[PDB]
């Protein structure tokens, strides 16, 4: 319901990575699976990763944020690889069942 | 293009004598080494002690 | 050897100055300190807190100890 | 300007610079001990043996 | 005959507001404790309540009348 | 029995950071130590020769070793013998042993005072407020046979009979011995008993405050020179799009 | 090869650890704890190896040996007080150390954590036995109040502590066999160090973002050798000041008196880097439920890496985990408070409550919370 | 300097205890290096020339 | 062992005569730096022979 709907958008600004021009993805830890899926993204949206990351990494040695005109909005936020990451994990989770069989 | 590419402006970083586009920086580089390296010979001094 | 094997990266230009060109400490007022403020503002409700919690704990058990050392004239009234 | 001196002198080739922190560290010495032990010591006045010990040093 | 700078800054002391509150409630408890036959408090948080008091103000002027 | 009076805090000419001990009160307390709490007192670790240059003259530390007896030994035919002490004997023990010590303190047992001011919470503010402490005993309490009431020891049913008072000696440099005079000047001694590199110590804290001020702001400068590179550092994303 | 640093069998080693050895551009000061404990552990081995050449571990000659160091060796007084709070220095740098992993995640490489647990184990260990060296009151009675605990492990119990003694008590076989065990242990944390950052070396340094640093990595010299050294001399400053100033600040005065067997201390505490441990020994009355809480206060460690739950590393970006981060190190002061502390109320209500909420915010709440977060995330 | 004093005494023994404590774990170090420097190369054999061929 | 001039002698004579076995671990540690340098030398003469100096 559009109850956390609400709390989502507190939460999504509480934990304050669009401060650093950083999507909710690009936060993710790069376990085997978003490994996987990194590998799978468009080389547009890739490279587009890689800046953002590399942006971030640069505000965070200088103890800077971007000016908050920059900063990313909950409802604009892109969730670009959750859709790649479903499928990469639905593949494993077959294999494993498969394998069990 | 390359060409539409040029290098943003560090006024706000340069120090005082470099701060100015049509000076040579040559006439002032003794004094900005000379400075920073006076700090580290300082600091060998110091640790040495 | 860990350079050169390390990330496929595109399109992404940096510039960087000599830090003889530079100032070592720069804008201390314009940017530093606002900075400094920012970055404690952001995080002293977080920490605090606890901390704060923690201390009134403290003084408490710490009175409450010595406050059972007292004695209690309502236990010489009889006699 | 000594910045521009000193640069040309000591700092420049890497002997100079050696040259300079090892003369530089025994002139400190020197100086810098001196000026602690000059401080410690007033600021205890009379209290040392250094002060008091001529009331007893009479042979 | 010789004055021992301590014994008068006691003096001195005892004859402030917060000792002559402590000593006063020293003294009833001395009082009481002494009139009975079968009680078994004392006075100590008393007279260490006074001492605490008295003793504090003495180290404050104490040492200015020594060597 | 519970309840513990806790001392006050003088200020001892020696407390600052950088304050040094006072030697003429130095002095003084080992005068009182010699002639009062020796008597009972062991103080193993020091030695006459400690003395000099802090407290003493060589020639008067040696006097003062020699006003002593040691027992040396053994000697051709395997006896142990007198001899008059050196500078570099200890301090004379009051007893053989801690069993005889107590045996002539009703057993209490006289504690070694070389590091008693750090043996004890309070230090000299401790010792100081015990020696002028003694007082009688509130209402309600009784201090056995044998025991003294102090307030401010444990208990506070001391072994120890008040050793000081007024004039119970006199100092040969001419102060007023009174009785808080001495506890203050055996009290200082007492301080340096447990710590004879006091001095030194605070000499030394002074120069490495100076050096740490100097060279830290240093090597903050340079360590920010180096980093100016990336600090400053800006950057773009060009893609052909 | 066209230069020497990278051919050479050694130099190659020492390039490849501490010169072109990519870090992360953005690891802050939390990254310094590493090289501090390092060199901390440099020094403590050397003030050791300087006071050993002075010691004599004998109950009848320990006590005055370390006096007579104090006393009579040239500096000794310095280098026992700079060895005895670089005990100190050394704890709280490693306090420092874990902490940041926590925060940060770094306890996803795994095995640079569980070798970094068992530094941990075996620094304790050390510290154990260096305190009893002295053979003062609180050398004595703490060597006591903890061997006596392993007596409390059924059948191997009784045998277990009289073998760790070499006789029915902490006596004088017991000091001479932890003397050698101090002297030794340091040794194998300088071993088992390499290991820890060899496993480390695998991966890199992490940082504070908890994303991948590939795209801006910057060579560990002079970067991070100059922030280090500058980190050195930043903390050194408060310990030598301690050390300086105020020499018996953190130490027990019990420790001034020979240890004696026939006189309890009133007060039996362990240095204030134990007194956590302490307390959670002392919230279980039972002896063997009390030891074994003690063991799992370290023990935990081991778990950390099988409790994440986030699908994010570090705590950046999660608010509700850095509050409880630091209801934890709340938890934390507070338990070492309580360890200072007779066993007495309040005292003793308030320290099981912490030693309660110590296991639950570990074992119980950060998962939970992780698990709640992602969900906030939409994931 | 050695001795800690005028002759070979107490002071002398304490240090060459600790000495001989740790020397010990040097040995056990650069055996370490010792082995390290070796398989850059690998065994020499008694005929003295290349074992390529049969290893 | 104790590492005092008064002490040393008896420690390792306490420890031959006290500990379990104290004896045997003193002659193996004492000829074990026999065997050390037995070994030594015959290692050391091995590489002269076959050249594993160079
Ligand atoms: C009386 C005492 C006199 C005798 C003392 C002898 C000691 C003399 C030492 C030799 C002189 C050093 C020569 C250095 C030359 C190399 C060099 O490049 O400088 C060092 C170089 C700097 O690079 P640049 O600024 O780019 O210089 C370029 C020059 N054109 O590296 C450095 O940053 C080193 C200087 C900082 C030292 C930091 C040490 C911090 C330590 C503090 C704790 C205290 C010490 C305790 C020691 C423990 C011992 C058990
Ligand atoms: C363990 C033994 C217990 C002993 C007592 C514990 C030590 C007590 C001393 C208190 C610690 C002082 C630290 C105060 C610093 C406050 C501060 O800076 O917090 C905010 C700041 C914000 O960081 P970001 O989210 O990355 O922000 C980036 C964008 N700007 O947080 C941090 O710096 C990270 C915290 C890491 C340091 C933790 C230190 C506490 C140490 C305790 C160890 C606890 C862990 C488990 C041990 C069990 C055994
Ligand atoms: C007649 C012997 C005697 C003399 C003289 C004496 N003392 Fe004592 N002292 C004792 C005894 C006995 C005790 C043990 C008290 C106890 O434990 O009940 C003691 C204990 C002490 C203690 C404290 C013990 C504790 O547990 O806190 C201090 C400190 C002390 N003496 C200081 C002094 C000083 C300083 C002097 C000289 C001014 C002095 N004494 C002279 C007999 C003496
Ligand atoms: C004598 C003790 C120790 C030494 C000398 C040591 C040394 C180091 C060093 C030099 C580093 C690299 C720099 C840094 O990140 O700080 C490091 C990293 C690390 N150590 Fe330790 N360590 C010690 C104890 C431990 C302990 C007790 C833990 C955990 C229980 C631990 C966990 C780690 C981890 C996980 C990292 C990864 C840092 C990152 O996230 O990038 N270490 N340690
Ligand atoms: C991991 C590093 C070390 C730690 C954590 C450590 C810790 C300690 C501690 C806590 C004490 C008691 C200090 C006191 O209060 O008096 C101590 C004493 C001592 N340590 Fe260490 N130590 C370390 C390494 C060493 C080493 C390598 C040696 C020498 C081979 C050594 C030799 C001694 C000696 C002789 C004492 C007794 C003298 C004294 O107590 O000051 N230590 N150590
Ligand atoms: C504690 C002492 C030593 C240890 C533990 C040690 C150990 C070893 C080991 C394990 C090997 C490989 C097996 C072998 O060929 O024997 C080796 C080889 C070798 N060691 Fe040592 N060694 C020691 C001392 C020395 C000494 C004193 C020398 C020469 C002065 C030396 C020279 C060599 C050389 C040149 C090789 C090459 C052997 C070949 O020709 O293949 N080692 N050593
Ligand atoms: C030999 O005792 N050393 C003490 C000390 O302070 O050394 C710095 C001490 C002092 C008083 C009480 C308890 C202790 C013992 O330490 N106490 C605890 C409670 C402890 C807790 C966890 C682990 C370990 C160990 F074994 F080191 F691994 C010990
Ligand atoms: C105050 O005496 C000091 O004692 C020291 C002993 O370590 C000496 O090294 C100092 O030179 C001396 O001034
Ligand atoms: C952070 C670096 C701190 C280094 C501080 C060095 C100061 C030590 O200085 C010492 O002072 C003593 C007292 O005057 C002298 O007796 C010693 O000879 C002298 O070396
Ligand atoms: O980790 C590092 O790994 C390197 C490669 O194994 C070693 O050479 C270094 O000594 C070690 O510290």
């Known amino acids: 319901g559009r109850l956390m709907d609400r709390i989502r958008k507190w939460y999504y600004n509480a934990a304050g990575f669009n401060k650093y021009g950083l999507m909710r993805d690009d936060t993710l830890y790069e376990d085997d699976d978003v490994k996987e899926a990194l590998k799978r993204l468009p080389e547009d949206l890739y490279n587009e990763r890689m800046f953002r990351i590399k942006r971030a990494l640069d505000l965070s040695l200088k103890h800077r944020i971007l000016p908050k005109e920059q900063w990313v909005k909950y409802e604009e936020d892109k969730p670009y690889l959750e859709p790649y990451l479903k499928e990469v994990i639905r593949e494993r989770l077959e294999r494993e069942a498969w394998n069990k069989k | 293009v390359h060409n539409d590419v040029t290098v943003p402006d560090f006024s706000a970083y340069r120090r005082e004598d470099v701060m100015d586009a049509t000076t040579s920086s040559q006439t002032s580089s003794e004094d900005r080494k000379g400075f920073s390296y006076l700090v580290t010979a300082t600091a060998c001094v110091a640790t040495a002690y | 050897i860990h350079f050169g094997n390390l990330a496929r990266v595109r399109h992404i230009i940096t510039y960087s100055l000599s830090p003889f060109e530079q100032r070592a400490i720069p804008n201390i007022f314009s940017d530093a300190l606002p900075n400094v403020w920012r970055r404690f503002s952001s995080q002293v409700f977080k920490v605090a807190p606890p901390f704060l919690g923690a201390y009134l704990l403290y003084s408490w058990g710490t009175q409450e100890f010595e406050r059972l050392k007292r004695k209690n004239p309502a236990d010489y009234e009889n006699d | 300007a000594l910045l521009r001196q000193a640069y040309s002198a000591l700092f420049r080739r890497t002997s100079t610079f050696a040259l300079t922190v090892v003369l530089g560290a025994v002139l400190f010495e020197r100086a810098f001990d001196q000026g602690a032990d000059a401080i410690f010591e007033h600021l205890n006045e009379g209290k040392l043996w250094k002060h008091i010990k001529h009331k007893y040093e009479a042979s | ?57 003495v180290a404050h002027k104490l040492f200015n009348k020594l060597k | 029995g519970e309840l513990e009076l806790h001392p006050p805090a003088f200020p001892w000419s020696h407390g600052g950071p950088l304050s040094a001990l006072d030697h003429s009160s130095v002095r003084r307390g080992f005068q009182v130590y010699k002639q009062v709490c020796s008597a009972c007192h062991s103080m193993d670790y020091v030695a006459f020769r400690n003395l000099i240059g802090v407290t003493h003259t060589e020639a008067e530390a040696k006097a003062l070793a020699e006003e002593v007896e040691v027992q040396d030994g053994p000697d051709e035919n395997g006896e142990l013998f007198m001899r008059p ?40 503010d401790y010792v100081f407020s015990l020696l002028t402490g003694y007082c009688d005993p509130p209402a309600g309490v009784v201090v056995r046979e044998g025991l003294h009431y102090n307030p401010y020891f444990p208990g506070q049913a001391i072994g120890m009979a008040p050793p000081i008072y007024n004039e119970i000696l006199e100092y040969d440099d001419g102060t007023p011995a009174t009785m808080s005079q001495i506890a203050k000047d055996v009290c200082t001694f007492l301080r340096w008993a447990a710590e004879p590199e006091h001095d030194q110590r605070k000499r030394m804290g002074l120069k490495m405050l100076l050096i740490s001020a100097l060279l830290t702001s240093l090597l903050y400068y340079m360590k920010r020179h180096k980093w100016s590179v990336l600090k400053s550092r800006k950057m773009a994303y060009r893609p052909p799009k | 090869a066209p230069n020497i640093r990278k051919s050479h069998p050694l130099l190659k080693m020492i390039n490849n650890s501490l010169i072109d050895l990519p870090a992360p551009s953005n690891i802050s000061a939390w990254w310094n704890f590493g090289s501090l404990l390092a060199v901390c552990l440099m020094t403590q081995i050397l003030t050791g190896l300087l006071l050993a050449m002075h010691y004599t571990a004998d109950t009848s000659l320990a006590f005055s040996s370390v006096a007579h160091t104090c006393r009579n060796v040239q500096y000794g007084w310095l280098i026992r007080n700079l060895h005895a709070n670089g005990a100190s220095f050394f704890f709280i740098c490693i306090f420092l150390h874990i902490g940041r992993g926590l925060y940060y995640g770094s306890y996803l490489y795994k095995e640079t954590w569980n070798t970094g647990v068992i530094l941990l184990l075996t620094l304790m260990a050390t510290a154990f036995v260096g305190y009893v060296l002295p053979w003062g009151q609180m050398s004595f009675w703490g060597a006591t109040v903890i061997t006596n605990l392993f007596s409390a492990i059924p059948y191997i119990g009784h045998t277990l502590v009289e073998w760790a003694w070499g006789g029915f008590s902490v006596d004088n076989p017991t000091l001479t066999r932890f003397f050698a065990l101090h002297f030794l242990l340091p040794f194998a944390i300088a071993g088992i160090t390499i290991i820890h950052l060899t496993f480390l070396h695998e991966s890199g340094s992490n940082n504070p973002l908890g994303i991948s640093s590939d ?72 002896k063997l439920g009390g030891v074994l809480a003690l063991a799992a206060s370290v023990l935990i460690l081991f778990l950390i890496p099988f409790l994440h739950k986030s699908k994010q590393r570090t705590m950046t970006f999660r608010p509700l985990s850095q509050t409880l981060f630091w209801l934890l190190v709340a938890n934390l002061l507070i338990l070492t408070w309580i360890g200072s502390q007779p066993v007495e109320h309040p005292f003793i209500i308030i320290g099981q409550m912490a030693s309660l909420s110590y296991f639950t915010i570990l074992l119980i709440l950060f998962p939970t919370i992780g698990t709640l977060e992602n969900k906030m995330l939409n994931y």
Request: aromatic share 10%; charged share 25%; hydrophobic share 35%.
């Open chain 6, 85 to 124: 002490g050196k500078i570099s004997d200890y301090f004379p023990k009051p007893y053989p042993n801690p069993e005889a010590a107590r045996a002539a303190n009703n057993g209490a047992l006289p504690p070694d005072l070389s590091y008693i001011v750090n043996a004890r919470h309070g230090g000299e």
């Open chain 5, 1 to 57: 005959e010789l004055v021992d700078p301590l014994t008068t800054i006691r003096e001195h002391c005892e004859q402030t507001e917060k000792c002559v509150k402590a000593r006063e409630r020293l003294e009833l408890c001395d009082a009481r404790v002494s009139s009975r036959s079968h009680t078994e408090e004392q006075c100590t948080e008393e007279l260490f309540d006074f001492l605490h008091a008295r003793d504090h103000c």
């Open chain 7, 215 to 286: 795209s801006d990595k910057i060579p560990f010299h002079p970067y991070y050798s100059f922030k280090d050294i500058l980190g050195l001399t930043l903390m050194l400053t408060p310990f030598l000041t301690l050390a300086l100033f105020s020499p018996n600040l953190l130490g027990d005065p019990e420790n001034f008196t020979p240890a004696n067997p026939l006189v309890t201390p009133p007060h039996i505490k362990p240095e204030w880097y134990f007194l956590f441990a302490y307390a959670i020994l002392r919230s279980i009355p039972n």
